[PDB]
Enzyme design. Structure first.
Site, PDB file in Angstrom:
ATOM      1  N   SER A 131       0.823  -1.226   0.000  1.00 28.56           N
ATOM      2  CA  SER A 131       0.000   0.000   0.000  1.00 28.56           C
ATOM      3  C   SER A 131       0.840   1.251   0.000  1.00 28.56           C
ATOM      4  O   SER A 131       1.853   1.239   0.743  1.00 28.56           O
ATOM      5  CB  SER A 131      -0.891   0.049   1.235  1.00 28.56           C
ATOM      6  OG  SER A 131      -1.698  -1.104   1.295  1.00 28.56           O
ATOM      7  N   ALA A 135      -0.636  -0.603   5.619  1.00 24.00           N
ATOM      8  CA  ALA A 135      -0.288  -1.517   6.698  1.00 24.00           C
ATOM      9  C   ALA A 135       1.077  -1.117   7.305  1.00 24.00           C
ATOM     10  O   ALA A 135       2.010  -0.741   6.636  1.00 24.00           O
ATOM     11  CB  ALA A 135      -0.244  -2.967   6.189  1.00 24.00           C
ATOM     12  N   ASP A 182       6.492  -4.964  14.651  1.00 24.84           N
ATOM     13  CA  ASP A 182       6.563  -6.270  15.314  1.00 24.84           C
ATOM     14  C   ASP A 182       5.671  -6.229  16.548  1.00 24.84           C
ATOM     15  O   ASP A 182       6.126  -5.848  17.653  1.00 24.84           O
ATOM     16  CB  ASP A 182       7.990  -6.649  15.659  1.00 24.84           C
ATOM     17  CG  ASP A 182       8.046  -8.056  16.221  1.00 24.84           C
ATOM     18  OD1 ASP A 182       6.987  -8.660  16.515  1.00 24.84           O
ATOM     19  OD2 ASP A 182       9.163  -8.593  16.398  1.00 24.84           O
ATOM     20  N   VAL A 226       3.841  -9.116  17.399  1.00 24.77           N
ATOM     21  CA  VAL A 226       3.532 -10.517  17.640  1.00 24.77           C
ATOM     22  C   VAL A 226       4.819 -11.233  18.007  1.00 24.77           C
ATOM     23  O   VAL A 226       5.825 -11.191  17.286  1.00 24.77           O
ATOM     24  CB  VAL A 226       2.923 -11.188  16.381  1.00 24.77           C
ATOM     25  CG1 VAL A 226       2.645 -12.644  16.651  1.00 24.77           C
ATOM     26  CG2 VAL A 226       1.662 -10.525  15.890  1.00 24.77           C
ATOM     27  N   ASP A 227       4.781 -11.902  19.176  1.00 29.81           N
ATOM     28  CA  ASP A 227       5.909 -12.732  19.634  1.00 29.81           C
ATOM     29  C   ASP A 227       5.390 -14.133  19.967  1.00 29.81           C
ATOM     30  O   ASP A 227       4.190 -14.295  20.254  1.00 29.81           O
ATOM     31  CB  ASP A 227       6.612 -12.153  20.858  1.00 29.81           C
ATOM     32  CG  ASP A 227       7.279 -10.835  20.682  1.00 29.81           C
ATOM     33  OD1 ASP A 227       7.587 -10.416  19.531  1.00 29.81           O
ATOM     34  OD2 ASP A 227       7.506 -10.159  21.709  1.00 29.81           O
ATOM     35  N   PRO A 283      13.284  -9.569  19.716  1.00 28.12           N
ATOM     36  CA  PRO A 283      11.903  -9.738  19.223  1.00 28.12           C
ATOM     37  C   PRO A 283      11.752 -10.552  17.964  1.00 28.12           C
ATOM     38  O   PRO A 283      10.641 -10.825  17.514  1.00 28.12           O
ATOM     39  CB  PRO A 283      11.358  -8.306  19.046  1.00 28.12           C
ATOM     40  CG  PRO A 283      12.633  -7.558  18.650  1.00 28.12           C
ATOM     41  CD  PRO A 283      13.701  -8.188  19.565  1.00 28.12           C
ATOM     42  N   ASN A 325       4.826   1.034   2.749  1.00 24.89           N
ATOM     43  CA  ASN A 325       5.107   0.011   3.746  1.00 24.89           C
ATOM     44  C   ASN A 325       6.553  -0.054   4.171  1.00 24.89           C
ATOM     45  O   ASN A 325       7.066  -1.079   4.600  1.00 24.89           O
ATOM     46  CB  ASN A 325       4.651  -1.393   3.331  1.00 24.89           C
ATOM     47  CG  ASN A 325       3.223  -1.450   2.857  1.00 24.89           C
ATOM     48  OD1 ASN A 325       3.049  -1.618   1.625  1.00 24.89           O
ATOM     49  ND2 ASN A 325       2.229  -1.307   3.684  1.00 24.89           N
ATOM     50  N   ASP A 379       8.956  -9.214  12.411  1.00 23.94           N
ATOM     51  CA  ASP A 379       9.987 -10.243  12.475  1.00 23.94           C
ATOM     52  C   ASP A 379       9.955 -11.258  11.331  1.00 23.94           C
ATOM     53  O   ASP A 379      10.856 -12.106  11.277  1.00 23.94           O
ATOM     54  CB  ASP A 379       9.887 -10.977  13.830  1.00 23.94           C
ATOM     55  CG  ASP A 379       8.622 -11.772  14.015  1.00 23.94           C
ATOM     56  OD1 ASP A 379       8.238 -12.469  13.043  1.00 23.94           O
ATOM     57  OD2 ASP A 379       8.032 -11.754  15.125  1.00 23.94           O
TER      58      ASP A 379
HETATM   59 CA   LIG Z   1       8.200 -10.780  17.275  1.00 23.64          CA
END
Ligand SMILES: [Ca+2]
Lengths: 557, 208
Positions: free
Chosen positions: A1, A69, A73, A75-76, A205, A241, A252
């Site tokens: 995007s 978007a 990061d 999400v782990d 991370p 992005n 990640d």
């Molecule tokens: Ca992560």
């Protein structure tokens, strides 16, 4: 995007211009839905994915907004300690804790139903389990618990009349999404919105963390930490992005990087070319970025340096000469099938050979495949989404920049050979491959162009229309699934805001039982291909002046 | 004006404009026009976001359905909806109620109003609730554009690099291929404006 927001100091004949091209892939019926809402504190116009209650792309006569978007990061993965003695439990803060579980049954048309269990810990749902190590992997999202709040933030932001009101709602949007603002006074702004975890010291991370308690997130970072800018000194805000801000870390995902090679530079080159941009010039950035080969600017200097001592008859030099004469803009020939210049095919083959010789060879199998893509990967329906510089190409770009790169070359990707030798060897491969397919006269090489498909299956691969509803466009364009532009305080009109968009194939997906398609089933498909756009109305007078039909409902809750 | 009235005006491209005097009515009009324009697409989006595709399309979507359901906790979404104020709930409830008004019309006169795709794919549309509306957003925005991780694969790559290069050089080659941050990355916000003030571990110290 992509997105470009042009503020007061960079706009010509207006105070601010916002041009958004969100890239979702291409679908029939349209990925987004045009809608205007008027009443109950709202006065908005625009379009939005899957007809969400909140318009992702639109304006309210005072401010406008859009998104790309974010890819931060957020999400782990937590590696939970299991025990064969206590099935269904995990170790957390010195105690064996029960996992939460639920059973689900998949009903199947013309088949037998399947039942399975989903498991969840304090750190999220379990993705996979390794019984050999007695470890279960749980996926923790910083936005867990804030899904509905994020939908509502996206709705309430539509009522904002200034930056403070808008950022109060940005601070409630928990997904990793770049949000953008512009207003009638010419202010512009940007927030990399979302919830991000406050990690323990030592937590890398990019890699999983133990789930036994010591490595649990401390909480969430405050909104003050989110990258943001209001009225930047540059006079514009551009994103494709790319990284929000210096020292901010990317997703990640191993195939995702923010490095020296970034397609957003193609937008910057166009915004910096002239002191100011009119709305028509801002819109034309869509067409040019749409057609721009992203690798030419990256690798042409390396190719020129490698070939600078060669004879005029050397094919390796002639391939580079061909690239030198080109600006990287692809245009279709009259057949509607081939590109006028062969440079993308030259770069594709060269880059494919370079990556095989460099990054691929440094990485153990089967991880090596992760680095072999050239960025010209597609389908016979054409690319399923945007085109980008591949991860292998971004890593190769750092290596070919030598000590200009800030990344330590812990392994020499050229394995002790002079870079020029490798670059020339990949050019010999390129000449062999392409001359065997097209012959030796580069001037007549008619290389295949990419096409674009409005697919009848949604992004999940699930039919959302019959297969015959698929629509085809000859020219692939690396651009928004929709594009919308908002112009503030134009000097060419007395209105405070003017706006346009394009929602192809059309607003309606309706087909009657007898096969009759709706009147608005395909009426934006030609406008899309030709970089056209239609006016978005806001006021009651403009709506009424452009009315095709109306219905009045009388309903009690 | 009456609180019961909803005016819908479509422009020359068929784009609908909703006029209403309260939140529920406004979102009801939105849902209603969505159900007129995009019912099949929205039904299939619902099934995609809740993992109920195989119910209508068969065995090829079983693994898909399981993968969708394994990636969320629906009762938690419902608890978030239960905690909404009346005003916020009205957004979701109005939307669902407006789609249902049109769906009920469709199912009463399917010979003229049922989208052909339902006859093609062999089923009929059912009503919506606020949870369904929320899950369109979660499944298509949150899960598509905010649920991205490859940490297990990253750890396998790091293990393979340490096997090939040794512990120290393997970590340094991971840092070369999958850098934490790269200062030459073009940034939407210029460095003169600000920089991110946090520094991160870049040597897997969580297991040191
Ligand atoms: Ca992560």
């Amino acid at each position: 995007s992509n997105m470009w927001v042009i503020g007061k100091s960079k706009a010509q004949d207006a105070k601010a211009i916002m041009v958004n091209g969100p890239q979702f892939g291409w679908y029939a019926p349209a990925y987004t839905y045009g809608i205007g809402l008027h009443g109950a504190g709202y006065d908005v116009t625009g379009n939005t994915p899957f007809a969400y209650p909140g318009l992702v792309f639109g304006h309210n006569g005072v401010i406008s907004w859009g998104s790309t978007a974010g890819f931060g990061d957020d999400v782990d993965i937590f590696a939970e300690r299991l025990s064969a003695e206590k099935p269904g439990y995990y170790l957390h803060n010195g105690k064996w804790v029960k996992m939460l579980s639920r059973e689900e049954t998949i009903t199947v048309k013309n088949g037998q139903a399947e039942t399975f269990t989903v498991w969840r810990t304090v750190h999220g749902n379990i993705l996979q389990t390794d019984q050999t190590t007695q470890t279960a992997y749980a996926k923790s999202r910083a936005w867990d618990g804030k899904e509905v709040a994020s939908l509502l933030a996206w709705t309430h932001q539509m009522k904002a009349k200034n930056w403070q009101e808008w950022t109060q709602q940005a601070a409630k949007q928990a997904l990793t999404i770049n949000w953008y603002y512009a207003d009638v006074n010419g202010n512009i702004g940007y927030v990399h919105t979302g919830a991000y975890p406050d990690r323990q010291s030592g937590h890398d991370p990019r890699l999983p963390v133990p789930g036994t308690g010591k490595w649990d997130w401390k909480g969430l970072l405050p909104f003050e930490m989110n990258p943001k800018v209001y009225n930047p000194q540059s006079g514009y805000i551009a994103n494709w992005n790319n990284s929000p801000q210096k020292d901010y870390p990317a997703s990640d995902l191993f195939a995702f990087l923010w490095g020296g090679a970034d397609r957003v530079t193609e937008i910057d080159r166009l915004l910096e070319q002239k002191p100011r941009l009119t709305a028509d010039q801002a819109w034309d950035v869509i067409r040019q970025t749409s057609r721009q080969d992203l690798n030419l600017r990256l690798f042409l200097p390396t190719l020129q340096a490698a070939t600078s001592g060669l004879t005029q008859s050397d094919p390796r030099r002639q391939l580079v000469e061909t690239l030198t004469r080109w600006d990287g803009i692809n245009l279709l020939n009259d057949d509607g099938k081939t590109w006028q210049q062969p440079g993308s095919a030259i770069l594709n083959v060269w880059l494919t050979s370079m990556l095989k010789r460099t990054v691929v060879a440094a990485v153990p199998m089967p991880f090596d495949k992760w680095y072999s893509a050239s960025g010209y990967e597609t389908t016979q329906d054409g690319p399923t989404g945007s085109l980008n510089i591949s991860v292998g190409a971004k890593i190769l770009y750092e290596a070919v920049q030598g000590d200009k790169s800030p990344i330590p070359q812990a392994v020499d990707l050229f394995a002790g050979k002079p870079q020029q030798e490798v670059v020339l060897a990949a050019l010999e491969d390129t000449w062999e491959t392409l001359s065997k397919r097209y012959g030796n006269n580069v001037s007549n090489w008619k290389t295949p162009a990419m096409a674009l498909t409005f697919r009848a299956n949604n992004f999940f691969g699930v039919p959302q229309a019959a297969a015959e509803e698929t629509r085809h466009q000859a020219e692939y364009q690396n651009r928004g699934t929709e594009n919308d532009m908002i112009v503030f305080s134009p000097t060419t009109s007395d209105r405070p805001v003017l706006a346009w968009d394009v929602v192809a194939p059309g607003q309606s997906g309706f087909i009657a039982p007898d096969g009759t398609v709706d009147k608005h089933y395909e009426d934006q498909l030609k406008m899309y291909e030709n970089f056209g756009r239609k006016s978005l109305w806001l006021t009651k007078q403009d709506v009424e002046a452009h009315k095709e039909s109306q219905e009045v409902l009388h309903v009690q809750r | 004006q009456s609180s019961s009235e909803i005016k819908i005006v479509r422009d020359e491209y068929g784009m609908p404009h909703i006029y209403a005097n309260d939140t529920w009515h406004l979102f009801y009009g939105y849902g209603y026009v969505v159900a007129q324009d995009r019912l099949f697409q929205m039904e299939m989006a619902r099934r995609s976001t809740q993992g109920t595709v195989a119910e209508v399309l068969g065995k090829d979507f079983v693994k898909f359905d399981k993968d969708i359901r394994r990636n969320y906790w629906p009762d938690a979404i419902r608890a978030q909806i239960a905690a909404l104020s009346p005003e916020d709930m009205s957004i979701l409830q109005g939307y669902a109620d407006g789609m249902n008004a049109w769906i009920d019309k469709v199912n009463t006169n399917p010979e003229t109003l049922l989208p052909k795709q339902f006859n093609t794919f062999g089923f009929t549309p059912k009503r919506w609730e606020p949870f369904d509306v929320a899950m369109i957003f979660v499944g298509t925005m949150a899960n598509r554009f905010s649920d991205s991780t490859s940490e297990i694969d990253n750890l396998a790559l790091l293990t393979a690099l340490k096997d090939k290069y040794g512990v120290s050089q393997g970590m340094a080659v991971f840092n070369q291929l999958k850098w934490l941050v790269n200062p030459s990355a073009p940034t939407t916000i210029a460095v003169q404006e600000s920089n991110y003030p946090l520094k991160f571990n870049q040597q897997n110290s969580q297991t040191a």
